[PDB]
Structure formats: C-alpha cells, structure tokens
C-alpha cells in the first residue's frame, strides 16, 4: 500500500549500478507529468507518485479520464468567463521568472502552508442549473456515486435527461448549430480524398 | 491556416491503419513488483518540481560522467562554456542531438511547472495563468531552441501557430 508524503519529501530533500538504470525512463516521467496538468477551474490536484528508494525518478501514474459532455460544458463555461474577463479587465507573465543561478523552489517551506487563490468558476444559478450544481467543478465528478459511475476506476457513465439538457445548454459556445449532413457537401473526407486523387483544389479546401 | 489544418486532418484520416494485436502492456505494474520503487500520494506542483530537479540532476550527471569541467548547465537548462575551447575539448564535447533535445524538453517542462509555482504563491491571477499557459504552447519555437535539433518539429510549431489564429 501507500506511504506518507514526508518520507519521499525527505528522500528528495537530502539527496551506483542500482541508481544509474532508473534514469533511463526520464522522458516517460516528463510525459506523465505533462498529461496530468490541472484545469483552469481547479486549484490543487493530488496524484499518486512512484519513486525510487534514493529519489532517482518520480512518475505520476495516472491517466486523465474525463466525461466528455461534462468536459465540453466546463470548457464552454471557461470560454464565456474568459470573454467576460477580457471585456471587463492586462499583465502577461514575465517568462522564466526564476533566474539561472538559483535552484528551483522548495515546496515544503513556501507552498506547503500557503493557501491558494480563487480559481476560474462560473456562477451556476441555482434554479436552472440544479441537476449540475453539486458536482460541476470537482476533479473527477460523481466518482463515489454508484448510480452514475461504475466504480473507482471511473470508466463508464450514464446520466439522466435534464442533466444532459443542462450540459447541452451550458456548452452552446463550443458547439455548432447544424442539424443534418446537407452541410459539408463536397467538403467532407471522401470529397477531399477524391480531390487528392485527382490533384485538383476545392475552393476553401486543402492543396 | 484553415487550409493547412484541414490538410493535416486529411493526412491523419488517410494514413489511418488499425494497430497490431499484441499482449496487453503494463510498465508500472512491472515497476511495482520491483522492491526498488515505492508509492505515495503527492500534490501536482510538488512532483512537478521534483521532476525538473531530477532532470537537472540527470543532465548534470551526464555532464560530469565524462570528466568535463569547462561546461555549466543553468537551473533553467542553459548550457554554456566557461572559457574558449580547444581542438581536443570540442572532440570531448560531442554529444548527440538527443542530449540537447531532452534538454529543451526539460526546459519546456520547467517553464510549464514554474508558471504554476508563480501562481500558487499569489503573484499572478488564474486569469493571467490561463494566458501564460496559452503563450507557452503557442510559442515553444520562440521560447526554446528546440527547432534547431529536430527539423520535423517544424510541423508541430506551425499547427500550434494555425490554432493560434482561428481561436
């Protein structure tokens, strides 16, 4: 089973055939770090970590599973909120802030007891958004509910119809108002393959 | 930009082939049976700092394996000589492009991690953090010198330029 964070914190803080072979998988750790970056509506995110006995390498060991209509609805909410924020309010951040000769900052002394700021959240009026009000900004929403998600592995989902109506209403910016495939006429994959094979160019299509 | 994005989508749709059947693959399940690895639960920013300092330590070990004393790697991943080189010292400084490629990948990773470290200290707003993360993945080619090390990487920048325009 697991282990408390203070041990691995001491391991990384205080620190060769067994040590040299563990550094082979470093870009794999880079990939596992970068695919689990927290969303703009989250403040913190806890992840499991595999680590060597001497602190050689650290992985994130988790696949970022989301529910797709919830994900599109959350990004549409962020889209509306960021449009509102730019029409209301701008200082872009100064890149790389930490200088070349100083080491990266210690987590245990500077972030560990400092409470974070507020995230980016929409208001979610409690009358119309009532099916989605209790779970719309969690990390993995509805994970511990047996009625919607099959279990802790968080693989399958099924919702009710007012929930789908609300998530379709909130995501109206990232979606199209199309109804039928009378659109994309001579502008779909097979017409593009035909223009590829005949070496001609559709107006608006690729070359 | 529309025509180039649609061109890359047509190429990905045309070159699609089903993957080969195989035995199912699990790396960390093999790592867990090894007693040399342990498991815990941490915060994302803490492990994001541990990963970049471990990458700095790995590149520093790869520098000091061949008994090199005249090179210096910054904490923000910049490699500079300390003096003017000679003939034999340039022959002893012949690393592959994979070295500088992993160096620029760790540089990109340290930019992405420290953008969050600056946020959780209360310095910038999340409204400004969302701009800052959007500038990095759009301007990898301007913030890093990673385009010099792989030329096919020129495909990856312009697509991120094209999505820069539309949005």
């Amino acid at each position: 089973e697991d282990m408390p964070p203070e041990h691995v914190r001491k391991i990384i803080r205080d620190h060769k055939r067994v040590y040299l072979g563990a550094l082979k998988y470093m870009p794999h750790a880079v990939l596992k770090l970068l695919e689990n970056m927290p969303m703009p509506w989250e403040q913190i995110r806890d992840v499991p970590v595999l680590y060597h006995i001497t602190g050689a390498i650290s992985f994130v060991n988790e696949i970022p599973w989301v529910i797709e209509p919830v994900y599109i609805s959350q990004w549409g909410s962020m889209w509306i909120m960021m449009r509102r924020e730019k029409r209301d309010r701008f200082k872009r951040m100064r890149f790389p802030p930490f200088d070349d000769e100083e080491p990266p900052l210690d987590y245990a002394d500077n972030i560990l007891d400092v409470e974070p700021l507020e995230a980016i959240q929409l208001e979610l009026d409690p009358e119309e958004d009532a099916p989605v009000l209790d779970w719309f900004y969690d990390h993995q929403p509805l994970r511990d509910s047996r009625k919607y998600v099959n279990g802790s592995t968080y693989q399958r989902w099924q919702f009710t119809l007012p929930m789908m109506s609300t998530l379709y209403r909130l995501a109206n910016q990232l979606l199209t108002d199309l109804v039928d495939d009378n659109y994309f006429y001579l502008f779909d994959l097979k017409a593009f393959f035909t223009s590829k094979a005949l070496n001609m160019a559709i107006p608006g299509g690729p070359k | 930009s529309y025509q180039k994005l649609l061109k890359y989508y047509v190429l990905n749709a045309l070159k699609h082939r089903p993957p080969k059947a195989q035995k199912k693959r699990y790396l960390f399940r093999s790592f867990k049976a090894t007693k040399f690895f342990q498991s815990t639960k941490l915060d994302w920013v803490e492990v994001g700092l541990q990963v970049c300092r471990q990458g700095y330590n790995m590149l520093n070990l790869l520098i000091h394996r061949k008994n090199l004393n005249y090179l210096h790697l910054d904490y923000n991943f910049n490699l500079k000589p300390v003096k003017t080189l000679t003939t034999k010292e340039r022959k002893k400084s012949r690393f592959g492009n994979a070295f500088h490629l992993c160096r620029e990948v760790l540089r990109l990773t340290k930019l992405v991690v420290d953008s969050h470290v600056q946020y959780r200290l209360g310095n910038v707003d999340a409204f400004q953090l969302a701009d800052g993360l959007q500038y990095i993945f759009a301007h990898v080619g301007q913030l890093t010198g990673m385009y010099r090390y792989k030329y096919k990487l020129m495909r990856q920048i312009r697509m991120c330029k094209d999505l820069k325009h539309l949005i």
């Binding site: 055939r17 | 090894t34 040399f36």
Partner: peptide
C-alpha cells in the same frame, strides 16, 4: 550483481510482449 539481474529480468519481461513474433 543482483540489481542488474533485476533490471535485465524487467527488460526481458518488456521484450516478452513481442518475443515469439520478433525473432
């Protein structure tokens, strides 16, 4: 000596995914 044997056994387990097909 044992640690290199452990990493070689893990590498042989990684190569076991395609062992009868590749050779």
């Amino acid at each position: 000596e044992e640690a290199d044997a452990i990493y070689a056994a893990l590498d042989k387990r990684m190569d076991e995914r395609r062992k009868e097909r590749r050779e």
